[PDB]
Structure 1
Amino acid sequence: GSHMKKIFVGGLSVNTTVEDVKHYFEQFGKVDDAMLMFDKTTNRHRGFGFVTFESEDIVEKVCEIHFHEINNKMVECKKAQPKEVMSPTGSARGRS
C-alpha cells in the first residue's frame, strides 16, 4: 500500500546506536525492531535508519510529532516509503 508499518529516522548523531533508537521509540508504543544504515567502509551509519512497529496507530502518533530528540540532537521521523522510490526517478528523497 501507500506506506509500510515502519518509520524513517533521519539526522541521527554518529554517537547514536540502533539500540538507542529502539529503546527511545518504545515511549510512544511497542517497537518491533530497528535498523541503522551501516557502511563497512567506515563502520559508522549513513546518518539515518528505520524503526518497525507493533501497530500503525503508533507509526501515526510518532510521525505526527515529526521532530524527535536523541543523544541531545534532533531527528526527523517520517512514514517509510514502499521501496519503489529507490528508482532514479525518486531516490533524491522524492514522492510519486
Structure 2
Amino acid sequence: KIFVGGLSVNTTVEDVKHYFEQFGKVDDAMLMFDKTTNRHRGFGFVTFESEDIVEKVCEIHFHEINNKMVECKKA
C-alpha cells in the first residue's frame, strides 16, 4: 500500500482513492484527517498493486489532491 500526507480539509478518501485509482488499481484508498479541527494536516493509506506508479508518484513530493500539493510516498 502507499502513504500520503498534507490531505487538506474538505478532502475525503474518495479524493485519494479516485486519485491514485487512476494511478494504480488502488483497491483501497484510506485517508486520515487530523482529530476535531486537526485539518492542518492528515495522512492517508492507499494501495495499488501498480508499484510502478507508487515508484514515481511515491517520490516527488508536491502532489495535487483535489486542490493540495500534498506529498505521496510508496508506503
Range class of TM-score, shorter chain: 0.7 to 0.9
Where in structure 1 do 4 or more consecutive aligned residues deviate above 4 Å?
A: 38-46
Percent identity of equivalent pairs: 99
Q: TM-score, normalised by structure 1?
A: 0.60
Give the 3 Å change call, closer, same or farther, for CA 17–45 of structure 1 in structure 2: farther
Which sections of structure 1, spanning at least 5 residues, go unmatched?
1-5, 80-95
Paired residues in the alignment total: 75
1:63, distance to aligned residue in structure 2 (A): 1.4
User: Any conservation in 1 of the 2:4–2:44 contact (CA below 8 Å)?
Assistant: yes
CA distance in 1, matches of 2:66, 2:25: 21
Which sections of structure 2, spanning at least 5 residues, go unmatched?
none
Give the 3 Å change call, closer, same or farther, for CA 20–47 of structure 1 in structure 2: same
State the Cα RMSD in Å.
Answer: 3.1
CA distance in 1, matches of 2:66, 2:49: 24
CA distance in 2, matches of 1:40, 1:70: 20
Give the 3 Å change call, closer, same or farther, for CA 39–54 of structure 1 in structure 2: same
What is residue 46 of structure 1 aligned with on the other side? Answer: 41
Q: TM-score, normalised by structure 2?
A: 0.74
Greater strand share, structure number: 1
User: Any conservation in 2 of the 1:11–1:48 contact (CA below 8 Å)?
Assistant: yes
